[PDB]
């Protein structure tokens, strides 16, 4: 299953990066699982993941780091609390969990560049 | 001549970006011209330029948004006043002007990413 996500995103001054992960639905999926994985160096790690009925909001483990909104064959993701060290490749994984059959799609990754604010005088 | 510059650089939250530009060591002390070209395909435009004798300090005198330092066959270019819309490809062009021969070197371009920061109250 084709998953597309932007090649590069810049985090804002507040360390919030947002991007669109959209999937090419092979059928009519009611339940979907989205996962954000961070790749680096040769390893992959799970950042956040929402399992949602398409017709409702997404709820994450922390949800202080990821938020998301579903809107058809796509989902608006937001990653928060980013610092420079978090610069890296963020992979969007999409799973269609219901109805059968299961489909799995993995996108090419979005490079997220993050900068730390410079010092600000007092106070 | 070979000119090396980093592939990607991030501007600070102050809208300042720096990168080193390195050229192939000339056979001798030479007058060197360093030029920053912004590439906005197919737009190519001079952002700033400076000339110095090797062994002297590089110093921009064009009143551009660029300042720089020099050491050996490297120059450290600092460009200030950048905003998000200035995100793009910045090419380091280096010319060995004289004593001859004349040599031209063009780097591969540094992609500079810039964000608009929050002010601080
Ligand atoms: C999701 O992204 C679309 C554009 O792809 C945007 O128009 C829409 O406002 C976004 N939904 C939100 C902000 O929840
Ligand atoms: C390049 O110049 C900037 C601004 O002066 C400085 O912060 C940085 O340390 C310099 N980098 C190198 C490699 O000299």
From Swiss-Prot, chain B:
Its main location: membrane. Residues 2-103 form the Ig-like V-type domain. GO terms for biological process: adaptive immune response; B cell receptor signaling pathway; DNA damage response; immune response; negative regulation of B cell proliferation; negative regulation of regulatory T cell differentiation; negative regulation of T cell proliferation; positive regulation of apoptotic process. It is a single-pass type I membrane protein. Widely expressed with highest levels in lymphoid tissues. Detected in activated T-cells where expression levels are 30- to 50-fold less than CD28, the stimulatory coreceptor, on the cell surface following activation. Homodimer; disulfide-linked. Binds to CD80/B7-1 and CD86/B7.2. Interacts with ICOSLG. Inhibitory receptor acting as a major negative regulator of T-cell responses. The affinity of CTLA4 for its natural B7 family ligands, CD80 and CD86, is considerably stronger than the affinity of their cognate stimulatory coreceptor CD28. It is linked to Systemic lupus erythematosus: A chronic, relapsing, inflammatory, and often febrile multisystemic disorder of connective tissue, characterized principally by involvement of the skin, joints, kidneys and serosal membranes. It is of unknown etiology, but is thought to represent a failure of the regulatory mechanisms of the autoimmune system. The disease is marked by a wide range of system dysfunctions, an elevated erythrocyte sedimentation rate, and the formation of LE cells in the blood or bone marrow. Genetic variations in CTLA4 may influence susceptibility to Graves disease, an autoimmune disorder associated with overactivity of the thyroid gland and hyperthyroidism. This is Cytotoxic T-lymphocyte protein 4. The gene is CTLA4. The chain holds residues 38 to 158 of 223 of the full protein.
